[PDB]
């Protein structure tokens, strides 16, 4: 696996943290669990996409961009 020679400095992971070592408050951890917090953020991000200009062009009235080097029919 790892490169030959001295092993990478701090390649060994720190020892695992216990349940009572995680430094998150119970009110925050339980709040995030029950309030579905991270997924409300994702819902919101879709909302601001909803109020952004669309990317769509109206083919064939509008055409996408092609270069001089474009290769079409002979």
């Amino acid at each position: 696996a790892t490169p030959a020679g001295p092993p990478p400095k701090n390649f060994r992971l720190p020892p695992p943290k216990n349940w009572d070592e995680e430094s998150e408050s119970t009110i925050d951890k339980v709040g995030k669990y029950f309030l579905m917090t991270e997924m409300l953020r994702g819902m919101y991000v879709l909302l601001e996409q909803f109020f952004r200009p669309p990317y769509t062009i109206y083919y064939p009235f509008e055409k996408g961009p092609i270069s001089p080097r474009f290769r079409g029919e002979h």
Binding site: W19, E22, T26, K29, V30, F34
Partner: protein, 78 residues
């Protein structure tokens, strides 16, 4: 790792809240009912909050003998 309740109840209640919240908080919410039944009624009557009288669901038949009423007899019909 996981604490045992009977060895350390408080460390277990912290672990149960963080690691198994839906189960642990079911027991809190459910237990909160019998706590409500034992504390709210005494304090409500303490502060003069009076339980209302039951609403009538059958004709309330008066007790005692009939009142020996005179008036509205057959002669009064015409």
């Amino acid at each position: 790792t996981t604490p045992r309740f009977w060895s350390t109840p408080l460390k277990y209640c912290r672990w149960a809240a963080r690691e198994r919240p839906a189960l642990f908080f079911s027991v809190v919410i459910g237990a909160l009912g019998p706590v409500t039944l034992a504390t709210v009624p005494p304090l409500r009557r303490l502060i003069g909050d009076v339980d209302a009288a039951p609403i009538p669901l059958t004709y309330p038949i008066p007790p005692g003998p009939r009142k020996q009423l005179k008036g509205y007899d057959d002669d009064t019909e015409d």
